[PDB]
Design a protein around this ligand. Sequence first.
Ligand SMILES: COc1nc(=O)n(C)c(C=C(CO)CO)c1C
Ligand SMILES: COc1nc(=O)n(C)c(C=C(CO)CO)c1C
Lengths: 313, 309
Amino acid sequence: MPTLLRVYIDGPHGMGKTTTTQLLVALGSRDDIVYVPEPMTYWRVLGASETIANIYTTQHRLDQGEISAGDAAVVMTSAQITMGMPYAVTDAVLAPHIGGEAPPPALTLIFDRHPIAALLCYPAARYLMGSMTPQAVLAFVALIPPTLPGTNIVLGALPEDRHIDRLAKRPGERLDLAMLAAIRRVYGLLANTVRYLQCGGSWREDWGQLSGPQSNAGPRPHIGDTLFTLFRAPELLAPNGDLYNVFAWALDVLAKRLRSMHVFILDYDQSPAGCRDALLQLTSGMVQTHVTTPGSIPTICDLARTFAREMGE
Amino acid sequence: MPTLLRVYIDGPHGMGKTTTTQLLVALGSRDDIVYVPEPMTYWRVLGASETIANIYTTQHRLDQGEISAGDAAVVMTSAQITMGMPYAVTDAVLAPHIGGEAPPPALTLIFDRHPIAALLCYPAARYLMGSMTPQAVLAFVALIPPTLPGTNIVLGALPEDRHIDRLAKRQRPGERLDLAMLAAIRRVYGLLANTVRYLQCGGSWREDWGQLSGPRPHIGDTLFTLFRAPELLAPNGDLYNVFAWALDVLAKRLRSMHVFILDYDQSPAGCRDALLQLTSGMVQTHVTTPGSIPTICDLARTFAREMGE
Ligand SMILES: COc1nc(=O)n(C)c(C=C(CO)CO)c1C
Ligand SMILES: COc1nc(=O)n(C)c(C=C(CO)CO)c1C
């Protein structure tokens, strides 16, 4: 069987993810690598009208106190559902084609983001921003699709000052530094969470250690430096102080989904060509999988280009 | 490994009786069977405040012209997420325990509803009520968990008049008696039954799609007909591929479900017996580990205790 390499480029917006990916794809032949780009078209037009604008306007209004917390949360929760749809369907149609984990791959699929961006990271950030309930965040977590073998996720590293500068220059977005801090924190916690789980961390065993980044490397993080720390929220706690079981099960799901992922960190604090070559080097250590049928490759190939043609800018 | 029988009791709400559910809870008194009840405490308190009230009030306000269709859709969409969370969490934790198809089962697990109630049927009914976009409905559809072996789903049959009678006597907290919603949810579940048969008999929605504009049910009598929604179509009339893929997922999820129809036009004891009758044709599975059975039990009873009424 031929092998496939899937690489999901993810992390906070405004670091240079899309550029780096396009540059990497531009190195290959036409059909040994395919890019599944940002579904900006779905977001601005097909799925709803100007979703990014709707999201940033609602946070602004909440910040200004023009709307209540409840009203912001219903908007954010609905918008996140829309934002996430293309990632989820892509995963669902790809799934039957992916075999076990496994020499150059027959095909490299590079994605602008993984489903967890829309079903975990952005929701968790909105929660920190006060515009989503933690119950809703865990409902998204509960819906995260089963983690396919060979899920390589590349997260970005960039100094806050450089990141702020980069964002300050370069849809419907507004310059929200609070959101920038929140999303950077969430992806930092994410990286630590994967390393925590892969080092044998059991959130149920360490829950009590809560009260008052890099993966593929380093020692086991403290649970307080992982995503689990976000869910020590009064809404989720029974009178006796413990998590309601329904929310505990959602954390069990979070652990299950993240623990089998392969996380890499890319330093974006360099030129676009620099990011490209750094990403290229990084792929050398990424996990390939077999495909389940011989015709999976061109099939998978057509799905990606179809996606790119229809929902890309 | 020991065998398991899962039975999801689903269909439009309001078809049953309090003596019906009591018999169900009575059934679960045994060691060999556990009843996983409706997570009403999650809906009213844990997940949000009075979600059901929120849902019916919003539709009411839309019906009266007090809010826009857009305003109702964001509230409706958000609320459906809360409604479905307990089913989705339960499926995700249970799924690794389910083995291949497999005589009495070591354990019978009876659920109040399947995830498709919250991720497909009620969203689709709200779409028909003009309070959810079809894009949102297909977003929920995209997230329906993979259908495992032995997914037995029981749908109810009851004439509409009789349904209205029963529904009127069992309104839930915050519920409003809405005959339009009753019709919508009944239509959706009827389409669902037809959709499973259509798929099981070889129906290909892509092949038959043209028939919506020009032996198994006709595609116009399945759920696929709902997604001819103009919001989902390009200027030339083609479905966008992203939505077509969601329909491919729908087809995959639904085709391998085993549907059983329970006639509710009878007594609670009769309904209970009929349900027991229906079990002889249901598909059992093995579990994946030796400790899967007691773990499943624990899950099911804990759910019941924490979230059941
Ligand atoms: C805060 O709003 C968002 N919600 C999301 O779900 N995503 C994926 C993103 C990410 C991007 C596109 O909106 C930029 O990569 C943003 C910004
Ligand atoms: C119309 O609102 C609903 N949305 C849902 O997701 N469910 C499961 C239900 C079903 C019931 C809760 O009242 C259970 O019968 C309703 C009514």
